[PDB]
């Protein structure tokens, strides 16, 4: 750190020092991870696109990307044909999924799976969901500190995803064991074994449901020979895997983020209890205020592009901050406070454009059932520790909590 003084004096007196200082990409420290909404507002005050750099962890590398902040600038980017999720500008099922597909080929996969994710067709799963939630609160621990995130938020999608693919009751516990292994890095070998076991088992379920149709939505996906074309045996597994990882962490932190807020907006935690007709707006307001996905998946510039009067060269990586657009005061009045009664439909927590959340209707209902069952029962709830001591997990795209310590009271 003992840099030669003459060299430093040469740079300081050059008057190029601010320009070189400006061109450095802003490293996203843990302060951003805890409180990015202040960082987004600090950035959007000056522009819409900013050169930022994630800390080593995208794998082990400080990756210079473009962070886009404005609501309309985010929204237009999510619908821009020049901003592809295919970064290319013997493939495994983990690399061929629809989320990474450009509209040329994405349209076919999106339409085939569309029919089975209808709001009403997704409502068939509700009593199977309603009952599944109820077991976890009965099995909830007895003492005051409960860590709601671990005991209820974590297991709920695991049983819901098991319903989604339509796992047979006999082969249930094996699938959940694979799922909990995959979502928690207990050891490199256990997740590696579970990942293969699930992909191979999913492929066998593809064959099993092929000749034996069943009520569950995965069988509806298999039965979808809609255009005289059907999803291929590889594409079924890729679609099913994307449902698993694309739905697990999102639904967990949808519950955790929402429940965390009402713990300090108890005057709105109450209001939800007296009126259950506000729940469909409660979930939307939860997703807008504290979107589980801070940013959409990485996008690459197809051609030369302009965002917020800042040119983006082709081949550059762009990160669309959904949390910034959701908390833009220009689109949502007083964006930093939870108001359950806002008009909905303007938020982009489910993204926008062609890659709009396929599991949105499932995620929509899930929290209302989760919150409502959490509302019908156990209403003396109170947060067990001041949020200042609580942390946020270090993640690239997800906004989630390390824990949700609650007191049942």
C-alpha to C-alpha distance for 387 and 166, rounded to whole angstroms: 38
Task: Sketch the per residue contact string, 259 through 298, with ligand HEM: x for CB under 6 A, - otherwise.
Answer: ----------------------------x----xx--xx-
Verify binding: residue 321, ligand HEM, rule CB under 6 A.
no
Write the DSSP assignment of 349-408 as a string of letters.
Answer: TT--GGG--TTHHHHHHHHHHHHHHHHHS-TT-EESS-GGG--B---SSB--BS---EE-
* Site track 331-350 with ligand HEM (rule: CB under 6 A), x = hit: ------------------xx
Per rule CB under 6 A, is residue 254 in the interface with ligand HEM? yes
CA 106 to chain centre: 20
Q: Tell me how far, at minimum, the Cβ of 251 lies from ligand HEM, in Å.
A: 4
Q: Number of residues in contact with ligand HEM, rule: CB under 6 A? A: 27
To ligand HEM, the closest distance from the beta carbon of 381 in angstroms equals 21
Three-state secondary-structure class, residue 290: coil
Please report how close the Cβ of residue 362 comes to ligand HEM at its closest, in angstroms: 5
Is 336 annotated to bind a ligand? Reply is no
**Residue 66 dihedral angles phi and psi, to the nearest 5°:** -105, 120
Question: Is there binding between residue 384 and ligand HEM (CB under 6 A)?
Answer: no
Closest residue to ligand HEM, based on beta-carbon distance: 359
**Binding track, positions 131-170, relative to ligand HEM; x by CB under 6 A:** ---------------------------------x------
Q: Can you tell me the distance from the alpha carbon of 240 to that of 113, in angstroms, rounded to the nearest whole number?
A: 10
> Is residue 299 marked as binding?
yes
Of 136, 206, 242, 370, the one binding ligand HEM (CB under 6 A) is 242
Is 393 within any annotated ligand binding site?
A: no
Q: Phi and psi for 406 in degrees, rounded to 5?
A: -130, 155
CA-nearest of 273, 304, 282, 307 to 366 is: 282
Tell me the CB-side half-sphere exposure of residue 247, using CA atoms within 13 A: 28
* DSSP-assigned letters across all residues of 99-158: GG--HHHHHHHHHHHHGGG-HHHHHTTHHHHHHHHHHHHHTS-SSSB--HIIIIITHHHH
Cβ 199 to ligand HEM shortest distance, Å: 16
Distance CA 67, CA 74 (A): 9
Of 245, 208, 300, 313, the closest CA to residue 93 belongs to 245
Stretch 348-367 residues interacting with ligand HEM (CB under 6 A): 349-351, 355, 357-359, 362-363
Strand 382-383, strand 406-407: pairing = antiparallel
The answer to whether residue 243 forms part of the interface with ligand HEM (CB under 6 A) is yes
Q: State which residue, 351 or 384, has the beta carbon closest to ligand HEM.
A: 351
Q: Which is nearer to ligand HEM, 75 or 384 (CB)?
A: 75
Tell which one of 110, 126, 230, 276 touches ligand HEM (CB under 6 A). 110
Site for ligand HEM in 172-231 (CB under 6 A): none
Q: How far is CA 113 from CA 205, 224, 245, in A?
A: 17, 8, 17
Non-local (6+) Cβ contacts of 50 within 8 A are 26, 43, 66, 67, 69
Enumerate the known binding-site residues: 106, 110, 297, 299, 355
Give the binding site for ligand HEM (CB under 6 A). Answer: 85, 98-99, 110, 164, 242-243, 246-247, 250-251, 254, 287, 292-293, 296-297, 322, 349-351, 355, 357-359, 362-363
**Which residues define the annotated binding site for heme b?**
106, 110, 297, 299, 355
């Amino acid at each position: 750190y003992d840099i030669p003084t003459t060299e430093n004096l040469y740079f300081q007196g050059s008057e190029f020092v601010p320009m070189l200082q400006d061109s450095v990409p802003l490293e996203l420290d843990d302060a951003f991870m805890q409180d990015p909404h202040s960082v987004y507002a600090r950035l959007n005050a000056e522009g819409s696109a900013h050169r930022v750099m994630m800390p080593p962890g995208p794998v082990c590398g400080g990756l210079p990307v473009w962070l886009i902040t404005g609501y309309e600038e985010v929204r237009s980017a999510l619908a821009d044909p020049r901003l592809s999720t295919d970064l290319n500008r013997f493939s495994s099922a983990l690399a061929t999924h629809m989320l990474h597909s450009d509209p040329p080929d994405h349209t076919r996969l999106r339409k085939l799976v569309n029919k089975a994710f209808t709001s009403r067709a997704i409502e068939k799963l509700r009593p199977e969901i309603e009952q599944i939630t109820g077991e976890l609160l009965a099995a909830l621990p007895d003492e005051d500190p409960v860590d709601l995130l671990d005991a209820f938020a974590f297991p709920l999608p695991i049983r819901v995803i098991c319903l989604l693919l339509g796992v047979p009751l006999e082969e249930q516990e094996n699938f959940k064991s694979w799922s909990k292994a995959l979502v928690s890095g207990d050891s490199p070998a256990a997740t590696a074994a579970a990942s293969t076991a699930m992909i191979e088992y999913l492929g066998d379920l593809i064959e099993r449901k092929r000749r034996t149709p069943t009520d569950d939505v995965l069988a509806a996906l298999v039965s979808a020979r809609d255009v005289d074309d059907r999803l291929t045996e590889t594409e079924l597994v890729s679609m099913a895997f994307l449902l698993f990882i694309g739905g697990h962490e999102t639904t967990v932190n949808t519950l955790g983020n929402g429940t965390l807020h009402l713990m300090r907006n108890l005057d709105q935690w109450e209001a939800l209890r007296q009126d259950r007709s506000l729940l469909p707006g409660a979930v939307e307001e939860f997703l807008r205020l504290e979107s589980p996905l801070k940013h959409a998946t990485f996008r690459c510039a197809t051609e030369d592009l302009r965002i917020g009067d800042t040119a983006i060269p082709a081949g550059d990586f762009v990160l669309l901050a959904l949390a910034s657009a959701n908390r833009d005061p220009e689109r949502f009045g007083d964006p930093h406070t939870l108001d359950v009664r806002r008009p909905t439909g303007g938020h982009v927590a489910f993204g926008h454009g062609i890659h709009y959340c396929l599991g949105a209707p499932l995620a929509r209902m899930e929290a209302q059932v989760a919150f409502g069952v959490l509302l019908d029962t156990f209403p003396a709830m109170r947060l067990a520790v001041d949020p200042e001591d609580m942390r946020w997990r270090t993640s690239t795209l997800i906004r989630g909590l390390h824990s949700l310590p609650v007191r049942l009271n």
